[PDB]
Design a binder for this molecule. Structure first.
Ligand SMILES: Cc1cc2nc3c(=O)[nH]c(=O)nc-3n(C[C@H](O)[C@H](O)[C@H](O)COP(=O)(O)OP(=O)(O)OC[C@H]3O[C@@H](n4cnc5c(N)ncnc54)[C@H](O)[C@@H]3O)c2cc1C
Ligand SMILES: Cc1cc2nc3c(=O)[nH]c(=O)nc-3n(C[C@H](O)[C@H](O)[C@H](O)COP(=O)(O)OP(=O)(O)OC[C@H]3O[C@@H](n4cnc5c(N)ncnc54)[C@H](O)[C@@H]3O)c2cc1C
Ligand SMILES: Cc1cc2nc3c(=O)[nH]c(=O)nc-3n(C[C@H](O)[C@H](O)[C@H](O)COP(=O)(O)OP(=O)(O)OC[C@H]3O[C@@H](n4cnc5c(N)ncnc54)[C@H](O)[C@@H]3O)c2cc1C
Ligand SMILES: Cc1ncc(C[n+]2csc(CCOP(=O)(O)OP(=O)(O)O)c2C)c(N)n1
Ligand SMILES: Cc1ncc(C[n+]2csc(CCOP(=O)(O)OP(=O)(O)O)c2C)c(N)n1
Ligand SMILES: Cc1ncc(C[n+]2csc(CCOP(=O)(O)OP(=O)(O)O)c2C)c(N)n1
Ligand SMILES: [Mg+2]
Ligand SMILES: [Mg+2]
Ligand SMILES: [Mg+2]
Lengths: 589, 589, 589
């Protein structure tokens, strides 16, 4: 009883649940692909236009809760095109199997055509990186690659000479260890550490909960704890979906891609409950410079006390920890700290709502997000690209745990949106998927819009056309001293979409946004991939990391100019709200 | 309130329990070392003669249950000398902090004297590998390096420009996260998996327990389980101390560095309980080629089903798993399989004992080990080097859990013995420490014998002088086809020892061994480091991976020659014992 | 017609002149070594005690003008032990072939015993780094490795699975490209650039010639040019042998390992003729801070204008360039600049000679060098280790082009002396070879003294025993602010030497030095390797990089203390000599 090595490989991938391979077919990968669909195998190939899109899609697939992704790249240039997707997965600790094709074994080291040592290529970021030495061990290595990708939460790479998959072996000369896959259940926290945390929280006059994705799946519990001890909630740029968008005590996120409330709260807080987070701006932006006590909860020992000295360290699942704390902590009836924060939050929501609900004028991204909120399904999935217009989505999207919002948050590679949409739609074929993209990022990946069309994976692409980079337009004055230089004409994305078999729309006026969005959604429900080219203004989101509103921190002229520029006449500095409740700023003046 | 960065670094190391730095002082490391012993700091420097010895000692320190080790290497050649120690730690998953000195910041990239990019040097094996960008962050990075070394169980590397440690900072500009150190407690296994294991064990006619270091600390329980279900025990080359050397059912280890019983048992077994092991020879030597069922217990998901398909996979602490299995499994009163094995083991012990107890003649390593057994403390520590004479120690040393036996088991670097002795003696100053070394390995490290002398860390070095490499003398016929070529004259190690301030002994006769060993131990108890130059024969340990004893596997001539060569006339093939109990070989004929 | 791959490999090495392989025999290298000496092959194996010594010897062999060296390291720890030797070769641009042994092909990627990916190990420093993919291509790759090592002037690395060399192939399936070896002849400089150089030299009032090893073989011409235009000569730490030690206008080298004259001259010069040098201290020590014009000659375009802006750049052989300049430049009859320099040099020689010729007292390295000068052959070879006592040899050894002086000048790895002696003696069996070593460096390599003994390669080891590191004792005050901490007892090296089959001597008094040196040389001429343990004082060489002698640069107290400490009462600051000739310092005051 013999079996083709390529088929054995497909059977192994199938056993691990990796039923989708992303890439472009070619010579150095043909032997493997030729076995797909054989003997009832269910592994399918999803062909992309650029390998980086395939790599990112394989990765985003897991981020969205899908199966283990597999991405391939032909010897040399195909393999190197995977880099942005693999680095993203490495930094986000996302499991993914990358198979690098290669010239046949006989050609290795001969300086043959497109023949090179690809082992160095991804050695720095991989959790597994090997060049298959002979055909007969390919199955064992693919099996281990999957096992390692999952166990080590990262990129497992295999360089495979193109002649190996054609070889035949005895069926008893291969096996899958997928049946032995086991994962650790939630780890219960140490009572000693939970008690120390409870004591600090009980004695704090200004507690604040800072929740990262470690709290995913436990938003209701966090909101319950927040209300019990009257502690406002701050979230991370990756964790907005965990909370009800309209939660009374949600202050948003800190720093640039955040809200005004969160940025003011963290500088006035006394005790922080850092739950399931590895906020990267912590040290360099002095996020916790005014905090007195720091309590951290995490399942990874490497993270304990990393972003700030921890007065209390809790090793364990955030869910279990939050529950234990919720049960032991004292209830707080009233709090000036809480009252002041709720008003500060309400003030901010009045501002955001007024921008979103404008009725006429030149289109701004604010109204595009408004239209999305008015037409999106309650369980819609959002694949967000990297840029100023897209990341500001967290100030507008009315999400809940029913949604999923993913991007490239740390490596922050542009072009992640479209790949994300493919991974999502592949995992949830009957679910509404949105790709929110800036024109710069769209320009790096729009050729792959045809991929959604060809594979009947309908998505809604929302493109923000604002000529010059909005975000980049904010780093030649706040850091530099000269002008700018980031111009771009204006290509017709809607026309390009039509040329690709997709449905294109173009909108540039607030009064036309709702209708255009309605037609776009209806078109998507008819099974079409759509591209909405939103010609927006040059307006930038109000800089919440530099709030020029407090008269004790900035001059009248500054405040006046700041308000006029961002239409923020009605925003009120947090200190006013603190003082209105009988409290005083702990750092201002 | 200011503080020297070097001192802050020492305070951090002290907080993590890393109170010993191994290396050689010099310019590119002086700024750091100059702060040692300041403001009551207790971090001490242990100066070696070769940096590789310092690196290996820092690593072996942890292997022996000591504190986190720190090793330093001066810019360029000092740092590169650490390689063998770091690779060993990487492959053994042992935490260790390596600090690479470097030319001052101003000289970087200038192609100055001894100035180079050292980031590539250890990037492949490190769990952390960074070049400090500016003086003020050195404390934070040393703190994280320790946190990462421990959490990731590996090598954390920092390249430190020599001018950084001289800089001063505010005391509030640094902190240690050592107080937040937390580790996961033993993980309880899934009842479902324990039950599946119990069912297989209950229905097995020939069960065998294969225990690796995952069972460290639970030998009594394993021995109890072995007796309850009448399953012989096989151990790994790293796990002998876990069992009482004279346990009735201990068959030893498989393959070359093993015993005859274990090698025959594994080929006749039906069900294997692979507990806490990652035996590297599994696949390439077909260790489990005749097994029917395979049950594996491990705390690392990456290992489940790695060395063989697992019919049952148990994720969890070996201790807890063994206890649960012991409690649920059915007791077995009698077993022909067990009886046959006990006799096979007894036959082997008769052979080994007869070699160890010879009374007169040219010295063989067998009698050296006999002398060690007759004079060593019950809690003696053994630091074993890499070679034929030293590794065969597991066939002779009468150990128990009261002992510790460590070597370089996977990377297998020669020269690990002396460094191991330093790490051990540093951790246990009042405990008997033995370094068992071959002359080849001794020749790579004997200059450091002076280190034990100078720091008053008395150890007993036992050197096997056999001219040509015993092990290497067995790879020019069993693999090659030509002669050999591994000669060495015979230097006077005892004389060298005296020249270094140590006490030297020379012995070449069996009838002189006991007295020499007695004087050596007495000398060590007087506070002296000793070197026993054992001039042994060219005799090689009987090859248990190729037992030429069964008349159905080898010819009369072969058996006759095999017996005469290894004085094994009385060894009896396991099949005879199986048949004597009414059983039949499952593979022979 | 078939041939063993191992033999084909040896035939190829032989054709490239690589007739000596350094290393230690073992399993993963046996297949290759088993073919040595077959079918009249003349490649021999030189067995060392530590692989780093083998690597360094293979490299030093070429530095001393020998054949292409080959060094081997067994899979894992053997290969990693080569690092210090390979990094040295990489930084010095010395050709060398390194063969890394490896577990058999079938074991690769199986996580077998001592099995690992060694491709990352030396990728950063190698000019060629490949893992042989299959047995049949081994010959082609060894051939290319030699071709690349030589053409790229660096380290060519091949990882070779241990089972490949055993395979047989058709004799017509391999060939050597050694017959096609071709090298570029000296490149003639552009007349345009030579003329620009001549013009500057002609118009300079204070010309100085700074000669690096690019001038090797052309010292007489440089000395002739120096005299013709009356330009003093400065040499590099690697180029002393190029000049007659007593040349009237030789000022020595600049910075720490240099002479007083050179250090003062460079700061007073106007035009520098930088010939064949890449002096690493140039920028970081501001060597040329006071120069007005800079003319550089080099055969490597990458070096032109590297160490300083070049007013004139000459691409070409230093010999040809010097000759063209010598022929076109104007002769200079007299020069105050020249006269002042000759007197400054003479003053320095009076100082050095008085220290070297002391008659009685505690031994200092000065008198050891004196004894060497009085007994060494005119064509003696000097292998110098890294340290304060050894590098200061350039202030004392009376060398000429008949000698060869080599060390590890840039990577600066300690332990280079003994390996250098092996490479030298292997290349010149009937030539006197000296290894000058500090006790610290000796302690990292003395086990290999037995290698010279066993292979009958008689060398004279001169060891400076000064307890604490002399050089290191000068970096805890001139850079740090605390005490020191670099103590070492005092082992009996002479006794160790005797134990190794060598002849040991011990000397600690000036009045005994000549006799001891005489007996040592006579013993070496009797075919014995000798070890002279020179117990010297703690005295440090006078710091020429910080001359506290000029009353306009330092205080009376400083000058007085400086003179008393270094017995330099009679040294006169260069400015006095300049002013005596009617000139003025261009920077002092
Ligand atoms: C252009 C751009 C701008 C951005 N701007 C901002 C900004 O202004 N503000 C902002 O906040 N973000 C911003 N981000 C996102 C930011 O870079 C980070 O990716 C994000 O804040 C990290 O969020 P996190 O801490 O929730 O999760 P991660 O960094 O993913 O860390 C999660 C932590 O939770 C732990 N964990 C996981 N599971 C559990 C469990 N069950 N129990 C306990 N612990 C668990 C993990 O071990 C880990 O330590 C931006 C991103 C981009 C691309
Ligand atoms: C020259 C030389 C020759 C050798 N020859 C032999 C030989 O012939 N035979 C031989 O057997 N060895 C030999 N060895 C040793 C061999 O190379 C391996 O290092 C050794 O067998 C590995 O043993 P192990 O499986 O116990 O542990 P490891 O390889 O260290 O693996 C231990 C396993 O236990 C798991 N674990 C850890 N803690 C727990 C826990 N609490 N609960 C559950 N699981 C846990 C780990 O995750 C891991 O999978 C030799 C070594 C040398 C240097
Ligand atoms: C501990 C220690 C201390 C030291 N201290 C000092 C010190 O104080 N002072 C000092 O001077 N040195 C010192 N050195 C040596 C120093 O580090 C350098 O290695 C040495 O100065 C480099 O000398 P170089 O310029 O002659 O040659 P290299 O750096 O080898 O460069 C030679 C140049 O010549 C060129 N070249 C080669 N062939 C030709 C040709 N035919 N024609 C033209 N150009 C050619 C090359 O391309 C190259 O640019 C020390 C070394 C050590 C280990
Ligand atoms: C692949 C990649 N290249 C470059 C960058 C740098 N970068 C970050 S934001 C940005 C501007 C992107 O502009 P666009 O997508 O048009 O978004 P906008 O800021 O205008 O909304 C750039 C170039 C990046 N993050 N990723
Ligand atoms: C650093 C290092 N170099 C080389 C090897 C290869 N090797 C393995 S065993 C061996 C022989 C060692 O001989 P010795 O220490 O004399 O022990 P013996 O086998 O004679 O008892 C060698 C060279 C190794 N394991 N480590
Ligand atoms: C392999 C290596 N390790 C460390 C250094 C750092 N280093 C440079 S000089 C020196 C002192 C060496 O002392 P020794 O050989 O005794 O010579 P001395 O200075 O006393 O004459 C050291 C440790 C180096 N150059 N190479
Ligand atoms: Mg844009
Ligand atoms: Mg030996
Ligand atoms: Mg010294």
């Amino acid at each position: 009883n013999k079996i083709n090595i390529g088929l054995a490989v497909m059977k192994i991938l199938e056993s691990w649940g990796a039923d989708t391979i992303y890439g472009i077919p070619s010579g150095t990968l043909s032997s493997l692909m030729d076995a797909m669909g054989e003997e009832e195998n269910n592994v399918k190939f999803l062909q992309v236009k650029h390998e980086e899109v395939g790599a990112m899609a394989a990765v985003m697939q897991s981020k969205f809760g899908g199966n283990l992704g597999v991405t391939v790249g032909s010897g040399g240039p195909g393999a190197s095109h995977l880099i942005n997707g693999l680095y993203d997965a490495a930094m986000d600790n996302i499991p993914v199997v990358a198979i690098l094709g290669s010239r046949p074994q006989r050609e290795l080291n001969m300086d043959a055509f497109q023949e090179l040592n690809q082992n160095p290529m991804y050695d720095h970021i991989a959790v597994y990186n090997r060049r298959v030495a002979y055909a007969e061990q390919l199955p064992k290595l693919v099996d281990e690659a999957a096992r390692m990708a999952i166990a080590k939460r990262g990129v497992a790479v295999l360089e495979v000479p193109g002649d190996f998959a054609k070889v035949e072996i005895d069926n008893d000369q291969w096996y899958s260890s997928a049946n032995s896959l086991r994962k650790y259940a939630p780890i219960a926290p140490a009572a000693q550490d939970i008690d120390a945390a409870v004591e600090l929280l009980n004695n704090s006059k200004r507690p604040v909960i800072y929740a990262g994705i470690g709290t995913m799946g436990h938003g209701p519990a966090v909101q319950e704890l927040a209300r019990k001890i009257k502690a406002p909630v701050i979230t991370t740029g990756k964790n907005f979906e965990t909370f009800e968008w309209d939660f009374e005590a949600l202050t948003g996120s800190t720093y640039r891609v955040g809200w005004k409330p969160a940025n003011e709260t963290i500088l006035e807080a006394d005790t922080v409950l850092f739950a399931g987070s590895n906020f990267p701006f912590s040290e360099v932006e002095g996020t916790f410079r005014n905090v007195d006590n720091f309590i951290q909860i995490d399942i990874d020992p490497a993270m304990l006390g990393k972003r700030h000295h921890a007065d209390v360290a809790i090793l364990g699942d955030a869910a279990l920890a939050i529950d234990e704390i919720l049960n032991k902590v004292d209830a707080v009836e009233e709090s000036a700290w809480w009252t002041a924060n709720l008003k500060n939050i309400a003030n901010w929501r009045e501002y955001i709502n007024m921008l979103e609900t404008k009725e006429e004028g030149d289109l701004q991204f604010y109204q595009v997000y408004n239209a999305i909120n008015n037409h999106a399904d309650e369980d819609a999935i959002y694949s967000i690209d990297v840029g100023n217009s897209t990341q500001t989505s967290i100030r507008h999207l009315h999400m809940t745990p029913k949604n999923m919002w993913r991007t490239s948050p740390l490596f922050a590679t542009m072009g992640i949106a479209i790949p994300g949409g493919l991974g999502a739609k592949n995992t949830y074929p009957d679910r509404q998927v949105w790709n929110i993209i800036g024109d710069g990022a769209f320009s790096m990946t729009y050729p792959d819009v045809v991929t959604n069309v060809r594979y009947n994976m309908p998505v809604i692409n929302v493109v923000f056309s604002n000529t010059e980079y909005a975000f980049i337009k904010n780093k030649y004055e706040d850091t530099n001293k000269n002008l700018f230089g980031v111009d771009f004409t204006d290509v017709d994305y809607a026309k390009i979409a039509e040329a690709q078999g997709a449905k294109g729309f173009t909108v540039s006026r607030i009064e036309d946004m709702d209708r255009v969005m309605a037609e776009a959604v209806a078109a998507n429900k008819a099974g079409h991939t759509v591209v909405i080219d939103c010609k927006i203004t040059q307006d930038r989101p109000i800089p919440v990391e530099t709030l020029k509103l407090d008269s004790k921190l900035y001059s009248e002229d500054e405040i006046k100019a700041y308000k006029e520029r961002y239409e923020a006449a009605n925003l009120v500095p947090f200190r006013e709200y603190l003082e209105a409740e009988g409290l005083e700023s702990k750092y201002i003046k």
